[PDB]
Amino acid sequence: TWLSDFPQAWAETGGMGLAVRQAPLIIPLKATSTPVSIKQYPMSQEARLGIKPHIQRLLDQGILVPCQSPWNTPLLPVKKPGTNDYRPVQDLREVNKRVEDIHPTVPNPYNLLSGLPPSHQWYTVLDLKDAFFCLRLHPTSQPLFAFEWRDPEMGISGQLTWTRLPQGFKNSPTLFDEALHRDLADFRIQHPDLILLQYVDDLLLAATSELDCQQGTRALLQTLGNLGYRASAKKAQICQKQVKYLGYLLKEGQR
DNA sequence: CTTTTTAAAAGAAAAG
DNA sequence: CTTTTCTTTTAAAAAG
């Protein structure tokens, strides 16, 4: 009953996440950057209708908010299969080039997995849902990520922007990985015996026994839920001696 | 949609 | 004429 025991840790039961211990992020620009406002390419009604429900949901969640900004980047509808289920994709390349580079601290998967000893053969794999959206953006940095949104001829006058760390932003993966490492530093200290690998939003908990893995998992879920992160109950792989993690199949200490 | 770069195919230029 | 190899421009494929 892992689901019922931890209502707050699961995206299915605890609502959209919010990393409450992390200060809103300020995104430093390069020394010479100036705002760039790129025109929105005309979108078909079919693409707009497909994207609308996603935008409205983000506005209701407060992840998107109206704004007037000197910055603007294009929104691109990306049809997964076909004329159905669209998803908004922002082209942030002109913003990415104006933001100051940070050192990439996310380890490559091969090196991260080198830290998995054979003694720990019981695994748990959690996938954090909408991880980036759990981190707030400082209000000074929100205008950077603005885009245009039009109910064809009326309604939201023009631009929207993000109040949370956005997809397509070049530093999101690193900033998220660093924030979650800060938030789980204690957990690691209270559980010296457990192994925890973090790859941005993909976590792997490794234990020596099935009980340890069960007690460790309970504690990890409890901590993540309290911190404001949410895991995907659907994808979770709990206390198994065989799991899929970062494209590998973990078993017998192999791969 | 637009920019990036990666790759493969086509078109000049040496050469005997 | 034919083979060689060098340039260059046309096309796919990642990407936000």
UniProtKB/Swiss-Prot annotation:
Binds 2 Mn(2+)/Mg(2+) ions for ribonuclease H (RNase H) activity. Residues 59-250 form the Reverse transcriptase domain. RNA binds at residues 41, 91, 93, 107, 171, 173. The reverse transcriptase is a monomer (Potential). Interacts (via RNase domains) with host release factor ETF1; this interaction is essential for translational readthrough of amber codon between viral gag and pol genes, as well as for viral replication. Mg(2+) 1 binds at residues 127, 201-202. Its cofactor is Mn(2+); Mg(2+). The reverse transcriptase is an error-prone enzyme that lacks a proof-reading function. High mutations rate is a direct consequence of this characteristic. RT also displays frequent template switching leading to high recombination rate. Recombination mostly occurs between homologous regions of the two copackaged RNA genomes. If these two RNA molecules derive from different viral strains, reverse transcription will give rise to highly recombinated proviral DNAs. RT is a multifunctional enzyme that converts the viral dimeric RNA genome into dsDNA in the cytoplasm, shortly after virus entry into the cell. This enzyme displays a DNA polymerase activity that can copy either DNA or RNA templates, and a ribonuclease H (RNase H) activity that cleaves the RNA strand of RNA-DNA heteroduplexes in a partially processive 3' to 5' endonucleasic mode. Conversion of viral genomic RNA into dsDNA requires many steps. A tRNA binds to the primer-binding site (PBS) situated at the 5' end of the viral RNA. It comes from the Viruses. It comes from Moloney murine leukemia virus (isolate Shinnick). This is Reverse transcriptase/ribonuclease H.
